[PDB]
């Protein structure tokens, strides 16, 4: 095993309920009624543009989408900062154990810089991460499920993608890892362990990072 690539949202922090609240609040502001629980189950995982188009019930331009997406992300960042959402159980321990083993690791996220700034600020990520090797959406690559984000992360760490572990919490993110050639381990923050195992090419899923060891991860790659 040459590296570990961590997804952030839904993987290192369990922030999906907060995203749901922010989209429900945005729906209420824009259309006058929040998204129902059934609406959000249908929509969870779609792009910000698709969410706003659902709320307006109309296809819009990329530039329209960016403006309302930024309103939603401003609400999310503000709530996240004052929330007590912590890094997932066992994550910090894994971070320290990895450095002690001289195994490089970094974060890849679909989040734009606005959100990443909050992540670094709130979670003191410079304690464990070189901030310049955190991969985020800077609009220079295709998002998940495309492989681009994880090839970008492996190249930043100077390692071969096929000897990388990726921790991911969504269907599109698991398929980004698989398409890149990395070995994914699912984080059961929204899907169950068994639901993540039903994906072809996902052969281990866990609830928290307390449930994984360096040795389990090395063996998964060798297999
Ligand atoms: Mg995620």
Retrieve residue 205's tokens.
């899923």
Q: Are residues 126 and 165 in the same domain?
A: yes
Residue 73 marked in a binding site: no
Q: Are residues 67 and 126 in the same domain?
A: no
Ligand 1 geometric centre to CA of 135 (Å): 13
Expressed in Å, this structure's resolution amounts to 2.0
Ligand 1 geometric centre to CA of 108 (Å): 9
SS3 assignment for the chain: CCEEEEECECCCECCHHHHHHHHHHHHHHHHCCCCCHHHHHHHCCCCHHHHHHHHHCCCCCHHHHHHHHHHHHHHHHHHHHHCCCCCCCCHHHHHHHHHHCCCCEEEECCCCHHHHHHHHHHHCHHHCCCHHHCECCCCCCCCCCCCHHHHHHHHHHCCCHHHEEEEECCHHHHHHHHHHCCEEEEECCCCCHHHHHCCCCCCCEECCHHHCCHHHHHHHHHC
Q: Are residues 109 and 45 in the same domain?
A: no
User: What are the C-alpha distances in Å from 48 to residues 17, 60, 189?
Assistant: 16, 12, 20
Ligand 1 geometric centre to CA of 191 (Å): 11
- Give dist(CA 33, CA 119) in Å, integer: 30
Residue 15 marked in a binding site: no
Q: Are residues 114 and 27 in the same domain?
A: no
* Structural contact between residues 3 and 161, judged by C-beta atoms closer than 8 angstroms: no
Q: Are residues 194 and 128 in the same domain?
A: yes
Q: Which residues contact 43 (CB under 8 A, 6 or more apart)?
A: 23, 35, 50, 51, 54
Residue 130 marked in a binding site: no
State which approach was used to obtain the coordinates: X-ray
Residue 169 marked in a binding site: yes
Q: Residues, the chain, total? A: 223
The order of strands in the sheet holding 3-7 is 105-108, 3-7, 164-168, 183-187, 205-206
Ligand 1 geometric centre to CA of 155 (Å): 20
How many domains is the chain partitioned into structurally?
A: 2
User: What are the C-alpha distances in Å from 90 to residues 8, 13, 179?
Assistant: 14, 11, 27
Ligand 1 geometric centre to CA of 185 (Å): 12
Q: Are residues 73 and 90 in the same domain?
A: no
Q: Are residues 154 and 58 in the same domain?
A: no
């Amino acid at each position: 095993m040459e590296a570990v690539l961590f997804d952030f949202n839904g993987t290192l922090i369990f922030d999906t309920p907060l995203h749901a609240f922010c989209w429900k609040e945005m729906a209420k502001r824009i259309r006058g009624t929040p998204l129902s629980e059934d609406e959000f189950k249908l929509l969870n995982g779609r792009t910000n543009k698709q969410l706003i188009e659902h709320i307006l019930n109309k296809e819009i331009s990329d530039e329209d989408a960016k403006k309302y997406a930024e309103e939603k992300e401003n609400l999310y960042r503000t709530m996240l900062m004052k929330s007590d959402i912590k890094l997932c159980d066992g994550a910090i321990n894994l971070f320290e154990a990895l450095k002690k083993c001289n195994i490089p690791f970094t974060i890849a996220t679909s989040s734009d810089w606005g959100n990443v700034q909050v992540f670094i600020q709130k979670y003191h990520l410079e304690e464990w991460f070189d901030i310049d090797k955190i991969i985020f959406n800077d609009f220079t690559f295709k998002g998940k499920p495309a492989p681009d984000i994880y090839l970008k992360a492996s190249k930043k760490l100077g390692v071969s993608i096929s000897h990388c572990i990726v921790f991911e919490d969504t269907i599109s993110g698991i398929h980004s890892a698989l398409s890149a050639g990395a070995t994914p381990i699912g984080i059961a923050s929204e899907m169950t362990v068994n639901e993540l195992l039903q994906i072809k090419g996902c052969n281990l899923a866990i609830h928290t990072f307390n449930e994984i060891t360096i040795e389990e991860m090395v063996d998964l790659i060798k297999n």
